[PDB]
């Protein structure tokens, strides 16, 4: 369910159980679902985690190195 569509391209969304309109999936379970498939959503729109921001969800990993 999408609300508050702006020109900058910003909206809010929340997820609901398939026919139970009263059952809203909690925000902590949607953040874990988006973190699992963020690389797949970025590729469908050609964005790169700085052009597709989920406010409240941050990229975390990536330790650098190689010289042994």
């Amino acid at each position: 369910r999408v609300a508050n569509l702006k020109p900058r391209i910003s909206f809010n969304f929340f997820v609901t159980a398939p026919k139970n309109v009263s059952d809203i999936i909690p925000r902590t379970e949607v953040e874990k679902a988006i973190r699992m498939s963020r690389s797949r959503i970025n590729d469908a729109f050609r964005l790169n985690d700085n052009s597709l921001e989920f406010l409240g969800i941050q990229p975390t990993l990536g330790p650098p190195n190689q010289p042994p």
Binding site: T60, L61, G62, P63, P64, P67
Partner: protein, 72 residues
């Protein structure tokens, strides 16, 4: 005496080339790999190669540490 110490700092920056992700181009991470080091986030990553990774500088002239073997 000191003019040949500036050349030893130039030789340290020449040895640290020959690699495409140059060592002064990015910050290292924390113990917990979640964010950058606290004084690399406030300052530049080039300042966290000269002051902390090359010199390992202290907070005053009145306290000195050890010989810092890689600059020896």
């Amino acid at each position: 005496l000191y003019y040949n110490t500036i050349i030893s700092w130039i030789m340290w920056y020449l040895f640290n080339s020959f690699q495409e992700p140059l060592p002064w181009s990015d910050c290292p991470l924390n113990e917990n790999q979640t964010g950058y080091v606290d004084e690399c986030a406030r300052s530049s990553p080039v300042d966290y190669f000269w002051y902390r990774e090359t010199l390992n500088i202290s907070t005053s002239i009145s306290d000195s540490g050890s010989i810092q073997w890689w600059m020896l």
